[PDB]
mmCIF file of all heavy atoms in Angstrom:
data_model
loop_
_atom_site.group_PDB
_atom_site.id
_atom_site.type_symbol
_atom_site.label_atom_id
_atom_site.label_comp_id
_atom_site.label_asym_id
_atom_site.label_seq_id
_atom_site.Cartn_x
_atom_site.Cartn_y
_atom_site.Cartn_z
ATOM 1 N N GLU D 696 -184.475 186.934 11.006
ATOM 2 C CA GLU D 696 -185.241 187.867 10.198
ATOM 3 C C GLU D 696 -185.106 187.543 8.735
ATOM 4 O O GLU D 696 -186.055 187.651 7.954
ATOM 5 C CB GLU D 696 -184.860 189.268 10.454
ATOM 6 C CG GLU D 696 -185.606 190.311 9.686
ATOM 7 C CD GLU D 696 -185.239 191.735 10.042
ATOM 8 O OE1 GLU D 696 -184.506 191.919 11.009
ATOM 9 O OE2 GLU D 696 -185.641 192.631 9.290
ATOM 10 N N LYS D 697 -183.867 187.260 8.299
ATOM 11 C CA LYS D 697 -183.633 186.928 6.834
ATOM 12 C C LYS D 697 -184.391 185.673 6.441
ATOM 13 O O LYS D 697 -184.871 185.591 5.333
ATOM 14 C CB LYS D 697 -182.114 186.762 6.626
ATOM 15 C CG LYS D 697 -181.421 188.090 6.231
ATOM 16 C CD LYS D 697 -180.079 187.866 5.604
ATOM 17 C CE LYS D 697 -179.435 189.074 5.155
ATOM 18 N NZ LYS D 697 -178.012 189.040 5.051
ATOM 19 N N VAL D 698 -184.468 184.677 7.344
ATOM 20 C CA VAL D 698 -185.267 183.505 7.044
ATOM 21 C C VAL D 698 -186.694 183.756 6.885
ATOM 22 O O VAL D 698 -187.433 183.190 6.027
ATOM 23 C CB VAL D 698 -184.946 182.419 8.094
ATOM 24 C CG1 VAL D 698 -185.543 181.047 7.611
ATOM 25 C CG2 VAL D 698 -183.516 182.278 8.370
ATOM 26 N N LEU D 699 -187.224 184.710 7.729
ATOM 27 C CA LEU D 699 -188.630 185.058 7.641
ATOM 28 C C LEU D 699 -188.923 185.891 6.377
ATOM 29 O O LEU D 699 -189.858 185.669 5.669
ATOM 30 C CB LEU D 699 -189.048 185.832 8.893
ATOM 31 C CG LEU D 699 -190.491 186.433 8.898
ATOM 32 C CD1 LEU D 699 -191.505 185.353 8.578
ATOM 33 C CD2 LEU D 699 -190.753 187.078 10.223
ATOM 34 N N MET D 700 -188.011 186.807 6.046
ATOM 35 C CA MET D 700 -188.240 187.699 4.901
ATOM 36 C C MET D 700 -188.100 186.878 3.667
ATOM 37 O O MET D 700 -188.768 187.165 2.668
ATOM 38 C CB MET D 700 -187.237 188.856 4.899
ATOM 39 C CG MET D 700 -187.528 189.830 6.061
ATOM 40 S SD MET D 700 -188.688 191.101 5.632
ATOM 41 C CE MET D 700 -188.156 191.572 3.968
ATOM 42 N N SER D 701 -187.231 185.875 3.631
ATOM 43 C CA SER D 701 -187.181 184.989 2.452
ATOM 44 C C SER D 701 -188.331 184.036 2.356
ATOM 45 O O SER D 701 -188.668 183.530 1.263
ATOM 46 C CB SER D 701 -185.848 184.092 2.582
ATOM 47 O OG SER D 701 -185.776 183.235 1.483
ATOM 48 N N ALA D 702 -188.984 183.685 3.514
ATOM 49 C CA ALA D 702 -190.176 182.807 3.475
ATOM 50 C C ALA D 702 -191.350 183.627 2.955
ATOM 51 O O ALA D 702 -192.219 183.019 2.322
ATOM 52 C CB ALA D 702 -190.435 182.264 4.819
ATOM 53 N N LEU D 703 -191.476 184.905 3.254
ATOM 54 C CA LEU D 703 -192.527 185.731 2.702
ATOM 55 C C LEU D 703 -192.435 185.934 1.165
ATOM 56 O O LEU D 703 -193.383 185.966 0.481
ATOM 57 C CB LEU D 703 -192.560 187.097 3.359
ATOM 58 C CG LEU D 703 -192.818 187.098 4.850
ATOM 59 C CD1 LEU D 703 -192.282 188.386 5.555
ATOM 60 C CD2 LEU D 703 -194.342 186.982 5.137
ATOM 61 N N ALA D 704 -191.131 186.032 0.675
ATOM 62 C CA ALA D 704 -191.028 186.143 -0.779
ATOM 63 C C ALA D 704 -191.428 184.999 -1.560
ATOM 64 O O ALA D 704 -192.071 185.139 -2.637
ATOM 65 C CB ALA D 704 -189.483 186.415 -1.063
ATOM 66 N N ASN D 705 -191.248 183.799 -1.012
ATOM 67 C CA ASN D 705 -191.819 182.576 -1.625
ATOM 68 C C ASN D 705 -193.368 182.603 -1.675
ATOM 69 O O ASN D 705 -193.894 182.212 -2.690
ATOM 70 C CB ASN D 705 -191.290 181.302 -0.881
ATOM 71 C CG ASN D 705 -189.821 181.187 -0.895
ATOM 72 O OD1 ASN D 705 -189.066 182.084 -1.146
ATOM 73 N ND2 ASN D 705 -189.316 179.999 -0.568
ATOM 74 N N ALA D 706 -193.946 183.052 -0.655
ATOM 75 C CA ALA D 706 -195.347 183.055 -0.621
ATOM 76 C C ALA D 706 -195.984 184.041 -1.593
ATOM 77 O O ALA D 706 -197.172 183.959 -1.921
ATOM 78 C CB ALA D 706 -195.873 183.416 0.862
ATOM 79 N N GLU D 707 -195.200 185.042 -2.064
ATOM 80 C CA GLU D 707 -195.735 186.079 -2.944
ATOM 81 C C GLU D 707 -195.327 185.804 -4.407
ATOM 82 O O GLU D 707 -195.877 186.446 -5.306
ATOM 83 C CB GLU D 707 -195.133 187.473 -2.523
ATOM 84 C CG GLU D 707 -196.101 188.617 -2.884
ATOM 85 C CD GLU D 707 -195.625 189.933 -2.420
ATOM 86 O OE1 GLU D 707 -194.687 189.903 -1.508
ATOM 87 O OE2 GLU D 707 -195.999 190.989 -2.945
ATOM 88 N N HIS D 708 -194.426 184.851 -4.649
ATOM 89 C CA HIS D 708 -193.956 184.583 -6.040
ATOM 90 C C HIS D 708 -194.344 183.238 -6.525
ATOM 91 O O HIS D 708 -194.965 183.092 -7.628
ATOM 92 C CB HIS D 708 -192.412 184.785 -6.056
ATOM 93 C CG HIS D 708 -191.839 184.369 -7.333
ATOM 94 N ND1 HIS D 708 -191.560 183.082 -7.709
ATOM 95 C CD2 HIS D 708 -191.352 185.094 -8.433
ATOM 96 C CE1 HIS D 708 -190.980 182.959 -8.805
ATOM 97 N NE2 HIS D 708 -190.873 184.190 -9.379
ATOM 98 N N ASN D 709 -194.026 182.192 -5.810
ATOM 99 C CA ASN D 709 -194.388 180.843 -6.206
ATOM 100 C C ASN D 709 -195.867 180.501 -5.932
ATOM 101 O O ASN D 709 -196.392 179.547 -6.566
ATOM 102 C CB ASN D 709 -193.548 179.790 -5.513
ATOM 103 C CG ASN D 709 -192.073 179.983 -5.739
ATOM 104 O OD1 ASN D 709 -191.668 180.978 -6.339
ATOM 105 N ND2 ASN D 709 -191.223 179.005 -5.247
ATOM 106 N N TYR D 710 -196.565 181.331 -5.173
ATOM 107 C CA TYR D 710 -197.983 181.067 -4.919
ATOM 108 C C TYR D 710 -198.673 182.473 -4.961
ATOM 109 O O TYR D 710 -198.025 183.494 -4.667
ATOM 110 C CB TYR D 710 -198.224 180.426 -3.593
ATOM 111 C CG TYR D 710 -197.236 179.316 -3.274
ATOM 112 C CD1 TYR D 710 -196.198 179.541 -2.438
ATOM 113 C CD2 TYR D 710 -197.382 178.070 -3.848
ATOM 114 C CE1 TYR D 710 -195.256 178.542 -2.117
ATOM 115 C CE2 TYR D 710 -196.505 177.022 -3.520
ATOM 116 C CZ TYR D 710 -195.475 177.284 -2.623
ATOM 117 O OH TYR D 710 -194.541 176.317 -2.361
ATOM 118 N N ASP D 711 -199.958 182.438 -5.305
ATOM 119 C CA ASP D 711 -200.705 183.725 -5.396
ATOM 120 C C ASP D 711 -201.400 183.987 -3.987
ATOM 121 O O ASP D 711 -202.584 183.702 -3.783
ATOM 122 C CB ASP D 711 -201.770 183.589 -6.489
ATOM 123 C CG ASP D 711 -201.132 183.350 -7.889
ATOM 124 O OD1 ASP D 711 -199.830 183.183 -7.917
ATOM 125 O OD2 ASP D 711 -201.862 183.219 -8.892
ATOM 126 N N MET D 712 -200.643 184.550 -3.119
ATOM 127 C CA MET D 712 -201.090 184.910 -1.842
ATOM 128 C C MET D 712 -200.950 186.423 -1.595
ATOM 129 O O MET D 712 -200.242 187.056 -2.355
ATOM 130 C CB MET D 712 -200.259 184.257 -0.659
ATOM 131 C CG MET D 712 -200.309 182.694 -0.796
ATOM 132 S SD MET D 712 -199.081 182.072 0.391
ATOM 133 C CE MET D 712 -199.548 180.276 0.309
ATOM 134 N N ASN D 713 -201.652 186.959 -0.588
ATOM 135 C CA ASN D 713 -201.587 188.350 -0.215
ATOM 136 C C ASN D 713 -200.762 188.315 1.166
ATOM 137 O O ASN D 713 -201.127 187.570 2.078
ATOM 138 C CB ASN D 713 -202.914 188.969 -0.006
ATOM 139 C CG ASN D 713 -202.902 190.442 0.152
ATOM 140 O OD1 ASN D 713 -201.821 191.072 0.165
ATOM 141 N ND2 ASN D 713 -204.029 191.114 0.254
ATOM 142 N N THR D 714 -199.764 189.214 1.233
ATOM 143 C CA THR D 714 -198.936 189.264 2.421
ATOM 144 C C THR D 714 -199.347 190.150 3.494
ATOM 145 O O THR D 714 -198.543 190.693 4.236
ATOM 146 C CB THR D 714 -197.471 189.638 1.924
ATOM 147 O OG1 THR D 714 -197.400 191.013 1.595
ATOM 148 C CG2 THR D 714 -197.076 188.832 0.670
ATOM 149 N N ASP D 715 -200.636 190.434 3.586
ATOM 150 C CA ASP D 715 -201.198 191.228 4.693
ATOM 151 C C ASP D 715 -201.994 190.447 5.691
ATOM 152 O O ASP D 715 -202.246 190.968 6.816
ATOM 153 C CB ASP D 715 -202.051 192.335 4.156
ATOM 154 C CG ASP D 715 -201.239 193.506 3.569
ATOM 155 O OD1 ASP D 715 -200.191 193.815 4.131
ATOM 156 O OD2 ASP D 715 -201.737 194.127 2.578
ATOM 157 N N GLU D 716 -202.431 189.279 5.374
ATOM 158 C CA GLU D 716 -203.097 188.362 6.352
ATOM 159 C C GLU D 716 -202.248 187.134 6.747
ATOM 160 O O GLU D 716 -202.790 186.241 7.313
ATOM 161 C CB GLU D 716 -204.467 187.871 5.709
ATOM 162 C CG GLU D 716 -205.447 188.977 5.373
ATOM 163 C CD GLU D 716 -205.336 189.376 3.874
ATOM 164 O OE1 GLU D 716 -204.724 188.615 3.106
ATOM 165 O OE2 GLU D 716 -206.012 190.379 3.487
ATOM 166 N N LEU D 717 -200.936 187.140 6.421
ATOM 167 C CA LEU D 717 -200.064 186.039 6.717
ATOM 168 C C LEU D 717 -199.782 185.983 8.231
ATOM 169 O O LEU D 717 -199.635 187.016 8.830
ATOM 170 C CB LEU D 717 -198.749 186.169 5.901
ATOM 171 C CG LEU D 717 -198.875 186.045 4.388
ATOM 172 C CD1 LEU D 717 -197.481 185.739 3.796
ATOM 173 C CD2 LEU D 717 -199.807 184.958 3.983
ATOM 174 N N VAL D 718 -199.683 184.780 8.713
ATOM 175 C CA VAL D 718 -199.257 184.546 10.132
ATOM 176 C C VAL D 718 -198.198 183.489 10.171
ATOM 177 O O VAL D 718 -197.957 182.744 9.103
ATOM 178 C CB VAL D 718 -200.527 184.000 10.942
ATOM 179 C CG1 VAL D 718 -201.533 185.130 10.975
ATOM 180 C CG2 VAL D 718 -201.070 182.760 10.412
ATOM 181 N N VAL D 719 -197.446 183.427 11.266
ATOM 182 C CA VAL D 719 -196.419 182.510 11.446
ATOM 183 C C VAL D 719 -196.975 181.275 12.138
ATOM 184 O O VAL D 719 -197.319 181.321 13.300
ATOM 185 C CB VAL D 719 -195.268 183.134 12.268
ATOM 186 C CG1 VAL D 719 -194.192 182.006 12.661
ATOM 187 C CG2 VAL D 719 -194.587 184.259 11.541
ATOM 188 N N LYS D 720 -196.959 180.160 11.393
ATOM 189 C CA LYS D 720 -197.601 178.966 11.921
ATOM 190 C C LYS D 720 -196.538 178.031 12.558
ATOM 191 O O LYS D 720 -196.933 177.362 13.639
ATOM 192 C CB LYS D 720 -198.265 178.155 10.748
ATOM 193 C CG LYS D 720 -199.146 177.036 11.196
ATOM 194 C CD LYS D 720 -199.700 176.241 10.062
ATOM 195 C CE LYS D 720 -198.710 175.230 9.567
ATOM 196 N NZ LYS D 720 -199.319 174.191 8.673
ATOM 197 N N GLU D 721 -195.323 177.923 12.043
ATOM 198 C CA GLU D 721 -194.277 177.077 12.630
ATOM 199 C C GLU D 721 -192.993 177.856 12.750
ATOM 200 O O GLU D 721 -192.632 178.662 11.822
ATOM 201 C CB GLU D 721 -194.117 175.909 11.755
ATOM 202 C CG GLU D 721 -195.258 174.936 11.789
ATOM 203 C CD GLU D 721 -195.506 174.244 13.174
ATOM 204 O OE1 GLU D 721 -194.581 174.074 13.961
ATOM 205 O OE2 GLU D 721 -196.739 174.072 13.535
ATOM 206 N N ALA D 722 -192.291 177.677 13.812
ATOM 207 C CA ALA D 722 -190.919 178.361 13.998
ATOM 208 C C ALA D 722 -190.194 177.528 15.008
ATOM 209 O O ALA D 722 -190.513 177.527 16.152
ATOM 210 C CB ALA D 722 -191.104 179.792 14.432
ATOM 211 N N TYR D 723 -189.155 176.798 14.538
ATOM 212 C CA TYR D 723 -188.405 175.929 15.439
ATOM 213 C C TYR D 723 -186.925 175.839 14.991
ATOM 214 O O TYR D 723 -186.608 176.178 13.847
ATOM 215 C CB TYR D 723 -189.007 174.557 15.483
ATOM 216 C CG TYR D 723 -189.230 173.835 14.105
ATOM 217 C CD1 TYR D 723 -188.193 173.120 13.560
ATOM 218 C CD2 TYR D 723 -190.379 174.052 13.466
ATOM 219 C CE1 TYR D 723 -188.470 172.531 12.363
ATOM 220 C CE2 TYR D 723 -190.594 173.475 12.169
ATOM 221 C CZ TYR D 723 -189.632 172.690 11.683
ATOM 222 O OH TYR D 723 -189.853 172.164 10.427
ATOM 223 N N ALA D 724 -186.025 175.445 15.837
ATOM 224 C CA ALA D 724 -184.662 175.316 15.532
ATOM 225 C C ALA D 724 -184.174 173.874 15.851
ATOM 226 O O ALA D 724 -184.519 173.399 16.956
ATOM 227 C CB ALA D 724 -183.747 176.328 16.305
ATOM 228 N N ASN D 725 -183.488 173.301 14.975
ATOM 229 C CA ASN D 725 -182.945 172.028 15.120
ATOM 230 C C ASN D 725 -181.405 172.160 15.384
ATOM 231 O O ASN D 725 -180.878 173.277 15.535
ATOM 232 C CB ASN D 725 -183.191 171.046 13.932
ATOM 233 C CG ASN D 725 -184.561 170.472 13.945
ATOM 234 O OD1 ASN D 725 -185.254 170.450 14.954
ATOM 235 N ND2 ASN D 725 -185.011 169.973 12.820
ATOM 236 N N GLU D 726 -180.624 171.056 15.401
ATOM 237 C CA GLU D 726 -179.260 171.084 15.639
ATOM 238 C C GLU D 726 -178.518 170.362 14.566
ATOM 239 O O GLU D 726 -179.033 169.405 13.974
ATOM 240 C CB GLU D 726 -178.865 170.505 17.005
ATOM 241 C CG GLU D 726 -179.056 168.999 17.156
ATOM 242 C CD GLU D 726 -180.500 168.628 17.546
ATOM 243 O OE1 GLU D 726 -181.411 169.500 17.436
ATOM 244 O OE2 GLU D 726 -180.767 167.451 17.956
ATOM 245 N N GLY D 727 -177.254 170.746 14.341
ATOM 246 C CA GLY D 727 -176.488 170.122 13.272
ATOM 247 C C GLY D 727 -175.186 169.596 13.797
ATOM 248 O O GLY D 727 -174.962 169.377 14.959
ATOM 249 N N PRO D 728 -174.200 169.361 12.925
ATOM 250 C CA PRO D 728 -172.929 168.851 13.307
ATOM 251 C C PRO D 728 -172.208 169.761 14.240
ATOM 252 O O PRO D 728 -172.320 170.993 14.115
ATOM 253 C CB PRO D 728 -172.196 168.594 11.980
ATOM 254 C CG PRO D 728 -172.875 169.416 10.974
ATOM 255 C CD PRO D 728 -174.307 169.468 11.415
ATOM 256 N N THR D 729 -171.318 169.295 15.110
ATOM 257 C CA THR D 729 -170.624 170.015 16.117
ATOM 258 C C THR D 729 -169.188 170.204 15.801
ATOM 259 O O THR D 729 -168.573 169.133 15.292
ATOM 260 C CB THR D 729 -170.793 169.462 17.537
ATOM 261 O OG1 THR D 729 -172.188 169.063 17.721
ATOM 262 C CG2 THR D 729 -170.426 170.414 18.552
ATOM 263 N N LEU D 730 -168.561 171.361 15.905
ATOM 264 C CA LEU D 730 -167.124 171.558 15.721
ATOM 265 C C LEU D 730 -166.405 171.350 17.005
ATOM 266 O O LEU D 730 -166.710 172.127 17.941
ATOM 267 C CB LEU D 730 -166.911 172.945 15.154
ATOM 268 C CG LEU D 730 -166.794 173.093 13.598
ATOM 269 C CD1 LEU D 730 -167.902 172.402 12.929
ATOM 270 C CD2 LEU D 730 -166.902 174.594 13.280
ATOM 271 N N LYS D 731 -165.507 170.374 17.083
ATOM 272 C CA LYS D 731 -164.853 170.033 18.356
ATOM 273 C C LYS D 731 -163.485 170.659 18.418
ATOM 274 O O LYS D 731 -162.603 170.266 17.656
ATOM 275 C CB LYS D 731 -164.760 168.543 18.519
ATOM 276 C CG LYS D 731 -166.179 167.839 18.618
ATOM 277 C CD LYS D 731 -166.044 166.388 18.811
ATOM 278 C CE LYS D 731 -167.450 165.698 19.028
ATOM 279 N NZ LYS D 731 -168.249 165.773 17.774
ATOM 280 N N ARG D 732 -163.246 171.653 19.239
ATOM 281 C CA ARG D 732 -161.984 172.285 19.538
ATOM 282 C C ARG D 732 -161.429 171.831 20.906
ATOM 283 O O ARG D 732 -162.131 171.131 21.625
ATOM 284 C CB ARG D 732 -162.153 173.813 19.370
ATOM 285 C CG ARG D 732 -162.759 174.278 18.110
ATOM 286 C CD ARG D 732 -161.843 174.139 16.947
ATOM 287 N NE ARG D 732 -162.519 174.182 15.665
ATOM 288 C CZ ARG D 732 -162.755 173.167 14.900
ATOM 289 N NH1 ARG D 732 -162.426 171.926 15.267
ATOM 290 N NH2 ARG D 732 -163.438 173.304 13.723
ATOM 291 N N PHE D 733 -160.232 172.354 21.204
ATOM 292 C CA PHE D 733 -159.647 172.100 22.503
ATOM 293 C C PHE D 733 -159.094 173.326 23.081
ATOM 294 O O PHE D 733 -158.808 174.351 22.355
ATOM 295 C CB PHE D 733 -158.536 171.073 22.292
ATOM 296 C CG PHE D 733 -158.937 169.689 22.173
ATOM 297 C CD1 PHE D 733 -159.350 169.209 20.951
ATOM 298 C CD2 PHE D 733 -159.062 168.816 23.284
ATOM 299 C CE1 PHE D 733 -159.785 167.863 20.757
ATOM 300 C CE2 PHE D 733 -159.514 167.550 23.149
ATOM 301 C CZ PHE D 733 -159.874 167.053 21.909
ATOM 302 N N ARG D 734 -158.966 173.343 24.405
ATOM 303 C CA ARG D 734 -158.425 174.546 25.102
ATOM 304 C C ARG D 734 -157.406 173.981 26.239
ATOM 305 O O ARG D 734 -157.797 173.128 26.982
ATOM 306 C CB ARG D 734 -159.524 175.347 25.820
ATOM 307 C CG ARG D 734 -159.071 176.468 26.678
ATOM 308 C CD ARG D 734 -159.902 177.704 26.675
ATOM 309 N NE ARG D 734 -160.076 178.213 25.280
ATOM 310 C CZ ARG D 734 -159.099 179.028 24.680
ATOM 311 N NH1 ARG D 734 -158.041 179.420 25.380
ATOM 312 N NH2 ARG D 734 -159.318 179.401 23.509
#
Side-chain angles (χ1 to χ4, degrees):
Chain D
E696 180 181 348
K697 271 195 175 156
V698 190
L699 174 54
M700 294 273 316
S701 179
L703 297 155
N705 298 15
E707 212 178 339
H708 173 279
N709 300 8
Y710 321 98
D711 300 1
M712 305 168 168
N713 192 359
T714 76
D715 282 328
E716 300 98 8
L717 294 197
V718 298
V719 171
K720 193 184 81 165
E721 294 293 328
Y723 53 92
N725 281 344
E726 69 275 16
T729 316
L730 268 45
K731 297 184 175 68
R732 307 286 163 257
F733 283 85
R734 173 145 302 277

